[PDB]
Design a protein around this ligand. Structure first.
Ligand code: CLA
Ligand code: CLA
Ligand code: CLA
Ligand code: CLA
Ligand code: CLA
Ligand code: CLA
Ligand code: CLA
Ligand code: CLA
Ligand code: CLA
Ligand SMILES: CC1=C(C/C=C(\C)CCC[C@H](C)CCC[C@H](C)CCCC(C)C)C(=O)c2ccccc2C1=O
Ligand code: SF4
Lengths: 65, 742, 42, 220, 141, 157
């Protein structure tokens, strides 16, 4: 939380970049209105993985630097 | 897609099939022509692949049978928690968990067995238990018999729940094969939900219950005037005074400021010096991290949506440097054979049980477990035996797959065909390395015996002689003793203290795991262990590979998995079946695990377990005689079997008289087994026909005609009584010795 | 109950009932007359 | 104790007699194999048919009766040696109070009198009973090796030696060497004999070592 | 009937195993089985593994008669094809072995004679004392 | 990478990267066990030399008096004794296997199929020559390594 901080920035950017990598990128029923796939399951998947990367990077930054 | 796929009322609940016995098959649902009918009834009782030849009915049967087993395990747990509630000294053990023997069984004073109620301590006369349940309950922060009583009622509730679930999932609403055959969902749920959320909720218990109550008990608190766990949940000031990290809340968690949560989720390596167990902060962090790990692992396979993996998609696309074109068709055999899955799962579950033993003796996770030497010995011994048995069952069910559930026409695999093709190279090289290992371990022992008997101790294989030092294991100990300083700086102390250092976590007048040294004797006995394991693997893998065909019987899969022989021809085919190979691998698993637990008990009683003095010098139980006596078989006979089996013969009188008795009786039943293994059905059938003449001469001829046991049944009874008697002898010996000395 | 009395008539169920009753009988006798080595009642 | 062990002796004699008489009178035939006389004295079996005919010969009756015989003589000689070593020591009361229960035979006879034996060679030296300790363990080893031939039966060993023959015929620099006698496993009745021989050799050597070492370590 | 005169017909597709002809073929007799498979299919061969027999004629050389007849019974019971195997000594002289009359041995073909056949019940055999110190046994009168 | 033996998939072996590699087929063909063209005596001498040169190691450095002054002087005699045992072993093997004059029992042809000449090692006189070569070369190698253990200075095993 504390929107605008580093812990928020390098988590938001990880989540959005994973959503992008699943949407228009290399990463990958439930008919959504999105143009090309990316169902709710894929959305939750990319959000989960981006949160994984975000936790990893914020705690690697809190360990050192 | 992964639907629910069940059907309503496939089987009618009734006692009609309770009445007619042996209903489940064609040749048993007629009635007893003989007395072999009874044995074949019990033998084929759970052989569901023989009753009905479809995976749907088989899978429903094993599913509801697993529910019955879970009901039994919950009933057994209810029993243990209840006997800890009303028939235990758990409060007196909590007050003084160093001089009060854990006791949760009381006998009835009827025929003089009341002397089995011993002076365990705490104003309580009972049997000193060795299950370590008291240690689990201190690791859970129980501190009251009311809590044990109510979780016993809860485990009875869950036993009734599992029994009703088995009834429901067989008789009222049973799944069909589309429910079991989907395994991506089964793995996803058993990872994220069973093992993921299971570890998560146990970490929640520990974070909210075990850590505060155990910190209070370690600080010194009467368990009666200790606050209850719900007081730690509700009263935030209390748990905050225990750990101020709770005062901030979960905004540490959700803002990823976990550095302030390091008051109760430490990576504090090593053992708790106040209580000899592991650090429960470390264990809570452990179960939490394991929960995250299995939760991200249970989202790997594709079940119903687009994301995930197909196990078929993985295995059929796994090319590699060594036969990677294979792995195709394994999803077919594993989703169409319960015996393949049973074999694989039994192998890994038994190996995990052995890992469990080896990691519980050395990293004792419960408080005051390392100093209850009976608890440590019993746990290691138990889980070793269970692991060996489960591996031998992996053999049995690999063989049953190879005979019944193996069709190269429909379900073909490249790797299994390649293994069956060069199977003679496998068994030949394994026979060779077994002979090599038998020689260069047991012949080292024989050389030591001969040299020590010829008065040439300079020529023995010892530390004061020709040295065979385990350089590799010693190097690993040297690294892991120095690991947390350079390689794992997050740990203040090593993962265990068996490596090395000036660390000896004594809780009272007892050691609890000083650094275990590795000398020539440890090399010798570790190679004995590799030896016995390789011979067990020889026998079992040989039965597996030759379950179908050989150079001797090329039509063995038509004879079955469990048949005696194919007659005295070809010289003789007496134990040619795969069943006979698991029957022999049972004896070799017995030899293996028995020498393993002998190594364990002697090594700990000589180099680890003991008393610690007020000057700071440790006096072990046997006295460090493992490095000089455990190089000769005469020393195992003298300094271990003859010496440590003094408390089991002096057991008569004191509570341990039962262990004395169960010594001899176990000694008997083992020998009673030798009536079966050595003999054969023909002699006993002829003796029985003479006795049947004696019964016809008194109008007391039975209608169930007396037949001697089947050949396979004679071998089964033999290996059964053999394992029972040997293992019960060792159990009596171990428990009497270690309850009478530590 | 029909076919439950046939199951309880089966050899192991009937043997465990008979030997549980018999063992309780012997157990309660040994509670009543413990440590017996002679028959002094004549 | 003398009563009880005399009845153990009677059990041994009657049971060895039972096995032997039953094999002698069922030597010509029984209901399970009425044509046994046509198969000779020593033959393995009559196949798995008719339920199973393992160890049906009169030879097999003999072979099981050697086990029961060695057990019987072990009882008579344990009784002899303990009664006499307690007489020679002086404490006949030891036998009279300890021979009535089997943990007295295991503690006060086997465990007690085998101390000076198994200490025939310790890590810090040896004494004159070193040979009897070594022979004790040797008899244990062959008494246990007989269990290999008695418990483990043929078929497993022929299908092992088939792999060994493959390996010898496909191992380089050992295709040069080839057997003249095709290496089959031991025959069935032969392996019962060999297991019985290891068993009896170990029985006899073990008890000779224990009975001489214990009776020569103290000499009464 | 005249034998079938083993030709140089092809063999199944097999990747090789450790169950073949070690030395009982080099110096002693080995065996060979021929079967006409209507289609190409997979089958579990008795020397361990799984081979793919070809369409039309197939030929497999085995080490002993039990392998041949086990495979033959599995063929006749599972694939319902007609097998017939031989015995080839290391100098030649291929011996026709299995049917020996064209029809399988379970059928009572005429011409085959009674050999190994006692015209008595099994318990009317004389005792060994009758045939003692004689080369004959109690089951050859 | 694995191949049935010589293409023949019904002989009890396989062409693997262990038994059929060209490095192995060069090594396991150019060593005296498989020098089928040379007379058996020279290759037997080579075998005996190679087996007696090293057999002194175990007897001299692990023997019953390796820690005394007669370490090599007795271990070499023990190795010569094992050579005199094994030449006797080979002698009785050649006597029991090949009687007096039979042709060679060896594999006649090679892997390719060319009519290779039969190995004379598997004859009576041939294996007798092999026995003599093994005995002479074994005592030779034992004495040569006895010479080297005290002459040449090594840190030993
Ligand atoms: C690119 C940014 C970044 C940076 C600077 C770091 C830096 C660090 N990470 Mg992190 N990590 C990252 C990305 C990053 N990681 C990603 C993308 C993941 C995958 C989710 C992880 C997962 C991860 C784990 C699981 C662990 C680390 C750990 C560490 C530390 C030690 C690494 C080691 O083995 O020594 C180090 C401070 C380790 C550590 O000790 O941190 C406290 C540790 O256990 N990281
Ligand atoms: C009282 C309720 C009830 C009734 C009337 C039935 C009736 C029936 N069941 Mg169902 N069943 C029930 C409850 C019930 N079941 C429950 C609770 C489960 C879950 C375990 C199952 C699971 C189940 C399966 C999987 C199968 C049946 C089958 C059957 C039929 C055969 C019964 C038979 O011969 O076995 C009678 C057997 C017993 C009475 C043995 C009881 C074994 C219990 C569960 C374990 C006890 C172990 C004990 C603790 C350990 C031994 C200790 C000892 C050494 C002292 C019959 C229609 C079979 C069928 O129809 O398929 C053809 C079948 O395959 N049942
Ligand atoms: C995340 C959900 C989940 C959970 C927790 C489990 C848990 C379990 N499953 Mg699995 N299973 C799942 C989903 C799940 N499964 C799915 C989706 C399928 C279909 C693919 C299967 C198919 C399956 C089979 C075929 C078998 C199991 C078995 C088991 C049990 C193994 C024994 C054990 O570890 O004891 C640990 C014991 C416990 C944790 C105590 C259990 C207590 C609770 C009440 C039950 C767990 C929740 C459960 C899913 C019921 C949900 C509510 C119900 C009313 C619908 C274990 C309880 C095996 C078994 O034991 O048979 C009964 C078995 O044979 N499961
Ligand atoms: C997950 C565990 C598991 C499961 C599900 C199974 C399931 C099965 N096994 Mg496998 N097995 C296992 C573990 C397991 N086994 C282990 C650990 C071993 C090694 C010992 C084996 C060895 C094994 C063999 C060798 C065979 C099987 C067979 C079978 C099948 C039928 C069993 C039957 O009807 O007996 C019903 C139950 C009994 C007859 C009771 C057994 C009594 C035990 C042995 C006595 C021990 C009890 C106790 C500890 C002693 C004290 C008792 C006291 C009263 C005095 C069934 C598919 C058989 C099969 O499929 O053949 C076609 C078979 O031949 N199993
Ligand atoms: C103490 C009793 C005993 C002994 C010594 C053996 C010995 C052996 N068993 Mg057996 N076995 C036994 C009991 C025993 N078994 C029992 C009771 C069972 C019951 C089921 C089995 C079942 C069994 C199976 C099922 C298997 C074995 C196997 C083996 C071999 C593995 C070890 C080996 O060859 O290494 C070297 C030899 C030894 C370690 C044996 C002791 C010899 C010592 C080291 C010294 C030798 C001295 C030297 C030769 C000088 C001799 C004197 C001189 C005058 C000639 C070996 C022949 C396995 C096998 O044959 O394949 C490898 C196998 O698969 N055994
Ligand atoms: C075969 C050998 C053997 C023998 C002879 C005995 C004999 C005895 N044992 Mg030992 N025992 C044995 C084996 C043996 N035991 C074994 C193998 C074990 C281990 C399992 C034990 C363990 C053991 C213990 C732990 C105890 C004994 C005790 C006893 C005594 C029994 C007293 C009792 O309760 O009976 C009383 C009589 C009965 C129970 C029979 C009653 C039968 C019913 C009521 C019908 C009779 C009436 C009938 C209708 C006829 C009336 C006539 C007319 C009017 C119709 C007795 C001296 C107990 C004792 O006192 O120690 C000395 C004791 O505490 N034994
Ligand atoms: C202590 C045992 C011992 C030792 C050290 C040697 C050592 C040697 N032998 Mg001798 N040999 C021995 C026992 C021994 N042998 C026995 C018991 C026999 C009787 C069969 C022979 C018969 C024999 C012959 C006939 C010949 C040798 C030769 C040789 C030499 C080269 C070939 C070789 O060893 O590699 C080859 C090793 C093998 C083929 C064994 C299989 C090993 C597998 C492949 C291991 C797995 C490797 C894997 C890739 C990892 C070498 C000095 C040759 C020689 O004198 O050369 C100068 C030679 O012609 N040996
Ligand atoms: C028990 C094992 C053993 C022992 C103690 C020795 C001991 C010795 N070896 Mg030997 N060696 C061995 C096995 C052993 N060797 C084996 C298995 C081989 C392969 C065949 C060799 C091949 C070998 C060679 C080629 C040479 C030695 C030499 C030596 C000596 C110095 C090194 C020393 C006496 C050297 C020497 O000159 O010996 C005096 C030498 O040149 N060794
Ligand atoms: C099997 C285990 C074992 C081992 C390792 C030893 C080892 C030894 N014994 Mg003991 N011994 C044993 C069992 C064993 N013994 C048993 C079971 C008995 C009684 C039945 C005895 C009774 C005994 C007595 C009474 C004496 C010994 C002695 C000795 C020593 C000298 C041996 C000798 O003459 O060297 C000869 C050794 C060889 C010829 C071995 C050659 C093997 C080579 C190295 C193998 C190389 C293979 C190679 C790696 C293959 C691949 C490579 C290739 C392709 C090139 C040595 C330390 C003597 C002693 O006291 O000295 C200390 C002595 O007097 N032993
Ligand atoms: C002892 C023995 C027997 C004889 C064992 C018998 C026949 C089995 C034991 C059966 C029990 C004793 C039957 C009685 C139990 C009944 C349920 C009756 C209960 C009623 C009262 C007795 C309580 C064999 O048939 C055999 C076969 C093959 C290899 C070795 C052996 C072997 O060693
Ligand atoms: S002795 Fe028993 S197991 Fe062996 S062949 Fe005869 S019947 Fe079969």
């Amino acid at each position: 939380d504390f929107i605008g901080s580093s812990t928020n920035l390098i988590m938001v950017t990880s989540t959005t970049l994973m959503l992008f990598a699943g949407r228009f990128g290399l990463a990958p029923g439930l008919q959504t209105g999105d143009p090309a796939g990316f169902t709710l399951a894929d959305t939750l998947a990319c959000g989960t993985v981006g949160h994984i990367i975000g936790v990893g990077v914020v705690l690697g930054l809190k360990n050192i630097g | 897609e992964v639907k629910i796929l069940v059907d309503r009322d496939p089987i009618k609940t009734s006692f009609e099939e309770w009445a007619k016995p042996g209903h489940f098959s064609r040749t048993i649902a007629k009635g007893p022509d003989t007395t072999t009918w009874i044995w074949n009834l019990h033998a084929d009782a759970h052989d569901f692949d023989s009753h009905t030849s479809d995976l749907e009915e088989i899978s429903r049967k094993v599913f509801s049978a697993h529910f019955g087993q879970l009901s039994i395990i919950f009933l057994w747990l209810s029993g243990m928690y209840f006997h800890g509630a009303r028939f235990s000294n758990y409060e007196a053990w909590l007050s003084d968990p160093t001089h009060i023997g854990p006791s949760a069984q009381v006998v009835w004073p009827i025929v003089g067995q009341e002397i089995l109620n011993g002076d365990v301590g705490g104003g309580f006369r009972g049997i000193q238990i060795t299950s370590g349940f008291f240690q689990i309950w201190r690791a859970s922060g129980i501190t009251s018999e009311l809590q044990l009583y109510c979780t016993a009622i809860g485990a009875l509730v869950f036993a009734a729940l599992m029994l009703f679930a088995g009834w429901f999932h067989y008789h009222k609403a049973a799944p069909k094969l589309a429910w079991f055959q989907d395994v991506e969902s089964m793995l996803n749920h058993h990872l994220a939900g069973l093992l993921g959320l299971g570890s998560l909720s146990w970490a929640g218990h520990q974070v909210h219950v075990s850590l505060p109550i155990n910190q209070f008990l370690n600080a010194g608190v009467d368990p009666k005037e200790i606050p209850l766990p719900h007081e730690f949940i509700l009263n935030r000031d209390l748990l905050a005074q225990l750990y101020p990290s709770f005062a901030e809340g979960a905004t540490p968690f959700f803002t990823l400021n976990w550095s302030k949560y390091s008051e109760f989720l430490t990576f504090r390596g090593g053992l708790d010096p106040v209580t000899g167990g592991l650090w429960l902060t470390d264990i809570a962090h452990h179960h939490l991290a394991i929960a995250i790990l299995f939760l991200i692992a249970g989202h790997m396979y594709r079940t119903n949506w687009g994301i995930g993996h197909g196990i078929k998609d993985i295995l059929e696309a796994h090319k590699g440097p060594f036969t990677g074109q294979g792995h195709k068709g394994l999803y077919e055999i594993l989703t169409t054979s319960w015996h393949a899955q049973l074999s694989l799962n039994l192998a890994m579950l038994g190996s995990l049980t052995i890992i469990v033993a080896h990691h519980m003796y050395s990293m004792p996770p419960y408080p005051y477990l390392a100093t209850d030497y009976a608890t440590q010995l019993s746990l290691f011994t138990h889980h070793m035996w269970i692991g060996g048995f489960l591996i031998v069952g992996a053999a049995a069910h690999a063989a049953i797959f190879m005979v019944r559930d193996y069709d190269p026409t429909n379900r073909y695999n490249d790797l299994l065909d390649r293994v069956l093709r060069h199977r003679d190279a496998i068994i030949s090289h394994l026979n060779w390395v077994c002979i090599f290992l038998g020689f260069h371990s047991f012949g080292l022992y024989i050389h030591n015996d001969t040299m020590s008997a010829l008065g040439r101790p300079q020529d023995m294989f010892s530390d004061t002689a020709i040295q065979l030092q385990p350089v590799f294991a010693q190097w690993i100990q040297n690294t892991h003793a120095l690991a947390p300083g350079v390689t794992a700086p997050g740990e203040t102390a090593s993962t265990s203290l068996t490596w090395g250092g000036g660390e000896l976590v004594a809780v009272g007048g007892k050691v609890a795991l000083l650094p275990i040294p590795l000398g020539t004797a440890d090399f010798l006995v570790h190679h004995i262990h590799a030896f016995t394991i390789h011979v067990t693997v020889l026998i079992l893998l040989k039965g597996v590979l030759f379950a179908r065909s050989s150079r001797l019987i090329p039509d063995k899969a038509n004879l079955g998995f469990r048949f005696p022989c194919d007659g005295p021809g070809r010289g003789g085919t007496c134990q040619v079946s795969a069943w006979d190979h698991v029957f022999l691998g049972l004896f070799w698993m017995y030899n293996a695990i028995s020498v393993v637990i002998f190594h364990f008990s002697w090594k700990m009683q000589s180099d680890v377990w003991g008393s610690i003095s007020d000057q700071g010098v440790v006096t072990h139980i046997t006295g460090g005689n493992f490095a000089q006596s455990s190089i000769t078989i005469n020393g195992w006979l003298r300094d271990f079997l003859w010496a440590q089996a003094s408390q089991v013969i002096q057991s008569y009188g004191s509570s341990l008289s039962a262990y004395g008795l169960f010594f001899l009786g176990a000694h008997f039943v083992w020998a009673f087994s030798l009536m079966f293994l050595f003999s054969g059905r023909g002699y006993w059938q002829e003796l029985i026909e003479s006795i049947v003449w004696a019964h016809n001469k008194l109008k007391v001829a039975p209608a169930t005609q007396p037949r001697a046991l089947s050949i396979i049944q004679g071998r089964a009874v033999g290996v059964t009584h053999y394992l029972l008697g040997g293992i019960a002898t060792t159990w009596a010996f171990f428990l009497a010795r270690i309850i009478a000395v530590g | 109950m029909r076919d439950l009395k046939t199951y309880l008539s089966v050899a192991p169920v009937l043997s465990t009932l008979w030997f549980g009753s018999l063992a309780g009988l012997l157990i309660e006798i040994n509670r009543l007359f413990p440590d017996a080595l002679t028959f002094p009642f004549f | 104790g003398d009563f009880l062990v005399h009845h153990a002796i009677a059990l041994g004699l009657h049971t060895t007699t039972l096995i032997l008489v039953k094999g002698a009178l069922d030597a010509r035939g029984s209901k399970l194999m009425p044509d046994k006389k046509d198969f000779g004295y020593s033959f393995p079996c009559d196949g798995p048919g008719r339920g199973g005919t393992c160890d049906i010969s009169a030879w097999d009756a003999f072979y099981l009766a050697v086990f029961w015989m060695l057990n019987t003589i072990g009882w008579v000689t344990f009784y002899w040696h303990w009664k006499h070593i307690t007489l020679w020591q002086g404490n006949v009361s030891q036998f009279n109070e300890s021979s009535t229960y089997l943990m007295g035979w295991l503690r006060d006879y086997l465990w007690l009198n085998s101390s000076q034996l198994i200490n025939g060679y310790n890590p810090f030296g040896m004494n004159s009973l070193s040979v009897w300790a070594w022979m004790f363990l040797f008899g244990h080893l062959v008494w246990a090796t007989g269990f290999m031939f008695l418990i483990s039966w043929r078929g497993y060993w022929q299908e092992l030696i088939e792999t060994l023959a493959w390996a010898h015929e496909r191992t380089p620099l050992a295709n040069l060497i080839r057997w003249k006698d095709k290496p089959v496993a031991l025959s069935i009745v032969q392996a019962r004999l060999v297991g019985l021989a290891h068993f009896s050799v170990g029985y006899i050597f073990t008890y000779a070592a224990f009975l001489i070492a214990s009776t020569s370590g103290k000499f009464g | 009937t005249p034998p079938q005169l083993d030709p140089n017909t092809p063999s199944p597709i097999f990747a090789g195993s450790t169950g073949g002809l070690l030395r009982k073929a080099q110096v002693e007799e080995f065996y060979v089985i021929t079967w006409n498979s209507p289609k190409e299919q997979i089958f579990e061969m008795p020397t361990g593994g799984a081979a793919i027999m070809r369409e039309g004629p197939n030929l497999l050389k085995l080490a002993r008669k039990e392998q041949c007849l086990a495979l033959g019974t599995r063929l006749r019971s599972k694939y319902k094809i007609t097998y017939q195997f031989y015995r080839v000594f290391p100098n030649g002289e291929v011996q026709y072995l299995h049917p020996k009359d064209g029809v399988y041995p379970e059928k009572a073909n005429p011409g085959r004679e009674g050999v190994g056949l006692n015209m008595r019940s099994i318990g009317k055999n004389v005792s060994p004392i009758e045939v003692k110190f004689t080369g004959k046994q109690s089951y050859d009168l | 990478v694995v191949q049935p033996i010589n293409g023949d998939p019904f002989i009890g072996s396989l062409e693997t990267p262990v038994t059929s590699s060209p490095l192995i087929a060069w090594y396991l063909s150019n060593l005296p066990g498989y020098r089928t063209a040379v007379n058996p005596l020279l290759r037997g001498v080579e075998v005996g030399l190679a087996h007696g040169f090293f057999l002194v190691g175990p007897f001299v450095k692990a023997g019953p008096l390796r820690n005394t002054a007669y370490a090599g002087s007795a271990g070499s005699l023990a190795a010569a004794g094992l050579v005199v045992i094994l030449s006797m072993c080979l002698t009785i093997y050649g006597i029991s296997s090949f009687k007096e004059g039979e042709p060679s029992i060896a594999p006649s042809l090679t892997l390719t199929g060319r009519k290779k000449q039969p190995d004379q090692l598997q004859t009576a006189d041939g294996w007798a020559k092999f026995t003599g070569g093994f005995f002479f070369g074994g005592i030779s190698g034992v004495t040569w390594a006895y010479f080297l253990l005290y002459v040449l200075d090594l840190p030993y095993f």
